[PDB]
Amino acid sequence: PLIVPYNLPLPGGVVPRMLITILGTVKPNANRIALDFQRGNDVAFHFNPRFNENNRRVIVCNTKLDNNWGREERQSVFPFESGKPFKIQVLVEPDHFKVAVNDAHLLQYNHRVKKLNEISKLGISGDIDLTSASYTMI
Numbered sequence: 061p062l063i064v065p066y067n068l069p070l071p072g073g074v075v076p077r078m079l080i081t082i083l084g085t086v087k088p089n090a091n092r093i094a095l096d097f098q099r100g101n102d103v104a105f106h107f108n109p110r111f112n113e114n115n116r117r118v119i120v121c122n123t124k125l126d127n128n129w130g131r132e133e134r135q136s137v138f139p140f141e142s143g144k145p146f147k148i149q150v151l152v153e154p155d156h157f158k159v160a161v162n163d164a165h166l167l168q169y170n171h172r173v174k175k176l177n178e179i180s181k182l183g184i185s186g187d188i189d190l191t192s193a194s195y196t197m198i
């Protein structure tokens with residue numbers, strides 16, 4: 061299917077009620093997954109499942125400004141499974157990114173980058189087979 065790393069343009073940037081849907085399958089022996097919502101060189105929203113950090117599964121979320129990472133937000137609830145198909149939904153809300161995986165709410169990420177309309181691309185990378193990446197307005 062699609063090539064990874066994958067760049068998904070977000071024409072005119074993100075806006076509340078925008079829903080991004082990523083369909084994929086985690087590769088066997090996977091180490092990492094990363095979604096990077098980018099504003100130019102900045103990463104507005106970095107969503108990074110890690111399969112083996114000190115023999116732990118953990119989701120790391122953060123923001124990258126002027127090539128510096130900020131305070132990490134961590135979610136120990138880990139809905140991904142090596143070898144298995146997943147669905148990540150990212151709903152843009154006025155004050156947060158809302159993330160659900162396989163139809164179950166996972167986490168919220170408060171907006172640190174405030175110029176939502178300038179977050180105009182989503183990079184998709186890591187140890188997955190990518191089936192599809194799309195968006196729609198709800």
Ligand SMILES: CC(=O)N[C@@H]1[C@@H](O[C@@H]2O[C@H](CO)[C@H](O)[C@H](O)[C@H]2O)[C@H](O)[C@@H](CO)O[C@H]1O
Pocket residue numbers: 106108120121122129130132
């Ligand atoms: C640059 C670096 O290695 N920083 C370490 C963190 O790893 C980075 O974390 C950011 C998100 O915060 C990105 O995921 C980047 O790809 C990672 O290299 C690491 O999470 C923390 C905690 O162990 O230590 C930093 O030094």
